Known about the structure:
Elements: no helix or strand
Amino acid sequence: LYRRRFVVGR
């Protein structure tokens, strides 16, 4: 994993 998994910008 990284730290952008959230990328709730979809």
